[PDB]
């Protein structure tokens, strides 16, 4: 009755960085690939209300500070049923399948983190030192992205870039939604091969 | 071609509680931020006539009866996707609607198909709760009591202060969150829920 | 006392398809038995979502510093009692009742640490296979070609499966036991693997019988 | 208050010899004679939970690395004075041992103080004993062969044969005598020196 672990990515960093675009952005070049949207968890996650099926899921501020979300990411990220909390009956009882979680921490098990990153700010964008937005934020006028319409420092790797603590790799937002998507895609080629021999 | 979401807020009570005045009031305050007026639409509203880019328009006695057309309106009101409004005479029609906040109210205990896209389009929703000290023989707001003004004033948003506002003589409970608000505190609260859904939307927006 | 998980090491260089393997072996022997599989991480320290599925299953199994993962798998493959490890205390405490391991690993490296006893782990596998792919599957870099390997056959004759590929038959990939130098597929490495458990429940049977 | 010490074996051999399948299948062998159960001790006990009077009492891994908190109690195990247990609940608490046997296995060549008067205890001590045909491929034993079972039975104690039993598979050597049995003969010889056992006290010590 079972499915395919989801493709799990952590950006950490202290405040101020912009963890929450990058999910915000990341989130949602995977989801648009994916003809979907993004469902996108409140802290302090209670109930999942809203959640139908949606590609992506983000969890903002992870691990504040008594553990229950750890549990409730447990079994998000398996390949084990998991039907999740909903406040309203009239959406009770729908599987969570969402392909990808990305999620945020702050800065200082983990086996389902397929990536686990820190993020960094590049100096230029830098500010008094934390996340220069609205600076950041405006339009680049070159497209060289392999996964968006029209581009901008938060997604070349300009303003933030994406570090890998377990194989020191630089990414952009652009290339680490294209390497969330590749080793998706390694998984499911797998399992409906498999999957496919005993329908 | 879209635009902001605007938050909405929604306000539940026994009638005569006071989430008319209630509304009048927070919608008012935003609009004075802003520099704007208020739309006051009225209660099974056919036409939303004399509407010109109000940053608040406010909804009174929301679903106060089937066949409950106000949803149909409303859930085109507090959206990203753009609405162009009905409209009696061929003069204003065509405006399309600006409105940076939506506040509503309805009855103390009624459940206004699709149950959760629509209540996301509530960023609050209050139960509204009157004192004692002001609330009246049957249990509403005793109105006359509650408007006379406060000695001094310790709100950010008010020229002036009354027990209406400070928290005194009505106060809002967040359904979800389960806050004590006054109502110079929920002003102060959706008015900085769309300072910052200003800030991440648009730039967020723009890649796509 | 339980009996000791029968168990299957497959052994090969990169991209000749060693997890399609292990995960087509795991799932068919979990189905002959009506049940799931259960699949560790690499350098795993916990097993948290084991309902006790009849088959486990280690990928890449060595990750050559490899203490942990010896020692842990020691005391998998046994006949005493065993208590896995857990991060939630919800599901702390179960027992570890699967009746067979498949686990993958890279070739000719050293195995053990030591640690060892060499000899001591070395027995805990009943079968000890290095994956070959055929020649007209192996691609340019000696890489499984996995689309063409995937195609479905057009006859099935097979022991274990309702459908069959390259991937079953021995078309695409074979295991040869090291110990034995005799050649499987992983419909009859599925068949051996069955026959053995069945084997190894008989002697309960057999030992009674005699009272 | 005392009784007739129970004849005892201990079996030695390298780890996956089958030196645990066959106490407690000489265990058994003997206790359905005596229409009795076994009681097994686990490694390293620490009480006897629900050992009621059964015949025989097989001792596992006995002198175990550990303590040799083994050796404490089997000291008081076959012995000739009354003992009663150590217990986790005091609902089973004060029951005698009245074991008739005591059959143990250790390791192969661990040496397991006063160490005479105390040796004496096994009867019969032994080294299993694994036959080259059934001999595994590192020295162990094939247990999935050696159990299968025997078209002939000229065993004396089983409903059915296999060579575990007939010796075909598992062999049994004394250390003092060096001969060499199945456990189908050793079980035959235990219950025989019980027989001698039981004979010559009951006569004797009612003189004192
Ligand atoms: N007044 C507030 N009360 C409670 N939570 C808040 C408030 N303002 C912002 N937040 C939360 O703050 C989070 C954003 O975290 P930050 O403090 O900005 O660190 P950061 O995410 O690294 O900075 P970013 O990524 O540019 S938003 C969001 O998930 C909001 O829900
Ligand atoms: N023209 C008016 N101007 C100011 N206050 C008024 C006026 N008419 C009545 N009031 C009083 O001011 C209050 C206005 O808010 P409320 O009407 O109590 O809110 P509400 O009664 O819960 O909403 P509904 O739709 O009227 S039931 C009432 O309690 C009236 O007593
Ligand atoms: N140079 C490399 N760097 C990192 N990973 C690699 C490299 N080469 C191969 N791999 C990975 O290691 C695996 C090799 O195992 P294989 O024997 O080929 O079976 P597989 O189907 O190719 O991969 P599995 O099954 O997940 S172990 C491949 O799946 C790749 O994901
Ligand atoms: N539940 C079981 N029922 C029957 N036979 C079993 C069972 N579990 C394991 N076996 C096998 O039956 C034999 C039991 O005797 P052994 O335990 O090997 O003797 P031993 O290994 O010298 O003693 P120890 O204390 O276990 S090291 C072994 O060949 C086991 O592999
Ligand atoms: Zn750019
Ligand atoms: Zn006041
Ligand atoms: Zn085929
Ligand atoms: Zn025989």
Same mark, same amino acid.
Not at 16 to 41: E, F, M, N, P
Not at 61 to 75: A, E, R, T, Y
Not at 86 to 112: C, P, Y
């Given at each position: 009755?079972h499915?395919?672990?989801?493709? $799990?990515?952590?950006?950490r960093?202290?405040?101020?960085?912009?963890?929450?675009? @990058? %999910?915000?952005?990341?989130? /949602?070049?995977?989801?648009?690939?994916?003809?979907?949207?993004?469902? &996108?968890?409140?802290?302090?996650?209670?109930? =999942?209300?809203g959640?139908?099926?949606?590609?992506?899921?983000?969890?903002?501020?992870?691990?504040?500070?008594?553990?229950?979300?750890?549990? #409730?990411?447990?079994?998000?990220?398996? %390949?084990?049923?998991?039907?999740?909390?909903?406040?309203?009956?009239?959406?009770?009882?729908?599987? =969570?399948?969402?392909? =990808?979680?990305?999620?945020?921490? *702050?800065?200082?098990?983990?086996? !389902?983190?397929?990536?686990?990153?820190?993020? +960094?700010? %590049?100096?230029?964008?830098?500010?008094?030192?934390?996340?220069?937005?609205? /600076?950041? @934020?405006?339009?680049? &006028?070159? *497209? *060289?992205?392999?996964?968006?319409? !029209? $581009?901008?420092?938060?997604? $070349?790797?300009?303003?933030?870039?994406?570090?890998?603590?377990?194989?020191?790799?630089?990414?952009?937002?652009? %290339?680490?939604?294209? +390497? #969330?998507? /590749?080793?998706? &895609?390694?998984? &499911? @080629?797998?399992?409906?091969?498999?999957?496919?021999? =005993?329908?």
């Amino acid at each position: 009755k079972h499915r395919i672990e989801p493709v $799990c990515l952590i950006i950490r960093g202290s405040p101020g960085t912009g963890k929450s675009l @990058a %999910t915000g952005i990341i989130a /949602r070049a995977i989801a648009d690939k994916y003809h979907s949207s993004v469902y &996108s968890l409140p802290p302090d996650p209670d109930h =999942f209300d809203g959640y139908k099926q949606q590609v992506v899921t983000v969890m903002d501020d992870l691990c504040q500070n008594d553990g229950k979300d750890m549990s #409730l990411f447990c079994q998000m990220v398996s %390949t084990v049923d998991f039907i999740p909390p909903m406040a309203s009956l009239a959406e009770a009882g729908v599987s =969570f399948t969402s392909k =990808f979680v990305i999620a945020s921490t *702050n800065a200082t098990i983990r086996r !389902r983190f397929y990536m686990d990153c820190d993020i +960094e700010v %590049t100096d230029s964008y830098k500010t008094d030192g934390r996340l220069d937005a609205g /600076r950041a @934020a405006k339009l680049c &006028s070159e *497209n *060289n992205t392999a996964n968006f319409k !029209r $581009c901008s420092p938060l997604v $070349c790797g300009k303003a933030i870039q994406l570090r890998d603590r377990k194989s020191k790799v630089r990414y952009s937002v652009d %290339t680490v939604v294209s +390497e #969330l998507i /590749r080793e998706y &895609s390694n998984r &499911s @080629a797998i399992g409906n091969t498999i999957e496919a021999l =005993f329908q």
